[PDB]
Design a binder for this molecule. Structure first.
Ligand code: NA
Ligand code: NA
Ligand code: NA
Ligand code: NA
Ligand code: NA
Ligand code: NA
Ligand code: NA
Lengths: 173, 173, 173, 173, 173, 173
């Protein structure tokens, strides 16, 4: 049953990739929930909505690239249920940015564990894939979200509705 | 707690839309699974893979349009778990097309029930939304999939690997 | 006699690069043999011929890039005889694709051993060179060849001459 | 006091980056000194001047990219004094090229030590950053400078003023 | 040892130019420190960062133009250590603008002393160089920084984080 | 076992073409070795390197054209080992040009013997092929290499490193 293409690809690596696929799809789902929270008539921050929808689509692309990797290496994709997000109501732009920062740090931690597994199994292709396509993207996302959190807090969010309004216009527009 | 925008929008309609959101996301997930099955080194039908990935992205757009509708009408989106597809291994191009036909008929049946509910609650905006954006799209998808199933069966699929190869090139390429 | 440029470059790494140069030139020669087999009047599969000639030229470029690396690092190139391929007659498009898959897996195995040596000698430049320019190229080549083998086998090669003819036209054309 | 962005970033790595910042700024300063030596009326080698000024600006960009990295990772930049170069008078084009080769090998050695520290602290983002942006750039610079030294020596520098003149015109122009 | 080009160029003028070179490089270093302070995840004012990086590069150009002058006149450049800035942490956009204003006034004072020395040594070329390339540039920089300080103070900086945010967007963007 | 295409093509001609294929591939390998000798940090003559790499690729094209001829005529290609060049170290640009001249005269001698065999076997197609595609190309290559040898010797190579430097720039650049 071994793939004709499979070479230097450990069963533990294959299992870890399947877990990372699920986590990227989960992240996509979280961002989708956030997006449509800011589209509510009683929230009405269109650029917050756009920002999180973009992040939702980016996470879906990250999941598809891992699925492609799994087939390239002769692993087998096993999909699992995509759990619903932890919240229906994300409270404020500041609260959503903070939850996004926490999500991205959790995804980064899972990728650092995958890199460590690849290095331990002497799988340099997999380690290089993670470094090239995932690790810098995560560091950038985490720095951006931290910048956003900082600005919203300095501007006086979440108490000042003016702060979220102006951030939506000037930073996210 | 009633939305300032909410008018002539029944709680039963709001609940039905939330169920339809989940079903569209489920369908997206099924098509994603199918796509990456045909990307396997031991299946290797690239145009089958492309066809199902396109259908996956289309279903995601259909889910997002229902989320937009729910906010337009002053309903509240409640997301649920996205269940994993029924199969990991889709067996053949003919078998996947047949499962896709069955999926699309199931989605169509849910939309016909939503239309009936909208008509029963005297919600013409919702009924028109379903007719305009969903019902013809479903009839077209079902006719296309039935055409594909017919052609694959006449060509001698799934037994003739030549049939699936040539269908992939000539119909899906 | 140490090069003025040489820094953190082990004699074992220099020797391994010289062996990899020979293996890339060998691979180029194998693909050249395959190419001109399919140009025979009694084989006459022009797109098989084109495919393998392209692969021959790509392998020559891979050998030249290793020669450039050896000089960049202050190593010394020592060329060896290029052994003749194992076959004069490659039997069928399916048989040549299978031999190509086996060749590429052998080259990949040698590169994975070179990466391991670079990591063991704490030569990150060399390890990065191998990851960046060789490891993903090999994974892609191996997945492509496995896809080709799969399609030819499903189509009914090598017994169906129609299969090889249509594969030549539709996949390789 | 931990940055909200900081993840898997050791205090020893942060300290090493601060040292590398200083060394890149130092290198920039050395090249600036060299540049304006060749602009002297009693030296008057304009293309030597241009070559070293370009290298000065490149080293400043390398320092700024490390400063950006330090902030991306949630480290804190601590700048130190930029020590003056070892020479005011660089004697000849050959002597400056030789000092440049020695400088670049010293910078490369510091980067190889930073890579080793990143690998020891299991910081793959940092290791990849160094490999991607620094290690190949250094190998190329060292090979170029060694080529220049070789050509100047073969041409008869530093004794032949004709050699430096013609090298300035033909190689550096 | 007198340069063949040297004419009407006092040793005191040559010494003063060497001091001004050091001060321009020092100023460049101060602005670089300021720039990367505003790039911190906990400060996150991108247009403040851009403004000070531009000023850093401008000061480096001013130092290089003095180095060119020193060679034009047959003086000899003697570089000194570039002292580290007085602060690692610049506290606020208002505090950095105020420190920048103080820096520019200090540089202007040194240039006015150089002009006075040139006039006292009857060096009209040097006096004209300073007037043409330095004195108006300094008056403009000082007026701009004073305008910025005024606006930030009127807007309610440094206490209002909204003030610095909006200044960053509207004045520096 | 006779090819359906084979007409007026002697077994001795087929054998001679197979020997000429090997000699063209050998020549390609010699030129490749020469190329990367001049790319060494301690040789560093880039236009010598380019010249010989071009000649390497031209010889490979000459071998492929003979392989095409062998199939056109219904002969069968039998590849042999490609022997390693006689030298690893080519000493100087003058020494490499002299070895190249000797190589080209050896290849020309083999082609003149092939033409004589074709004429003796009354194979005018083969004789015309050799005259049209090989004999003038060889006369031109031999005249060019003799011109290069003459110029390098008159300029004072190999003793004058200035000679090789200037030849590299002015003739080969
Ligand atoms: Na992701
Ligand atoms: Na749908
Ligand atoms: Na290769
Ligand atoms: Na890497
Ligand atoms: Na550098
Ligand atoms: Na200045
Ligand atoms: Na030839």
């Amino acid at each position: 049953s071994t793939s004709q293409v499979r070479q230097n690809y450990h069963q533990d690596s294959e299992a870890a990739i399947n877990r990372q696929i699920n986590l990227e799809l989960y992240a996509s789902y979280v961002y989708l929930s956030m997006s449509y929270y800011f589209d509510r008539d009683d929230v009405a921050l269109k650029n917050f909505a756009k920002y999180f929808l973009h992040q939702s689509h980016e996470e879906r692309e990250h999941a598809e690239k891992l699925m492609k990797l799994q087939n390239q290496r002769g692993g087998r994709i096993f999909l699992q249920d995509i759990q619903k997000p932890d919240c229906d109501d994300w409270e404020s732009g500041l609260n959503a940015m903070e939850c996004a920062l926490h999500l991205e740090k959790n995804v980064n931690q899972s990728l650092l564990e995958l890199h460590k597994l690849a290095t331990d199994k002497n799988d340099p292709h997999l380690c290089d894939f993670i470094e090239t396509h995932y690790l810098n993207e995560q560091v950038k996302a985490i720095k951006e979200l931290g910048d956003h959190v900082t600005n919203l807090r300095k501007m006086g969010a979440p108490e000042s509705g003016l702060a979220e309004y102006l951030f939506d216009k000037h930073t996210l527009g």
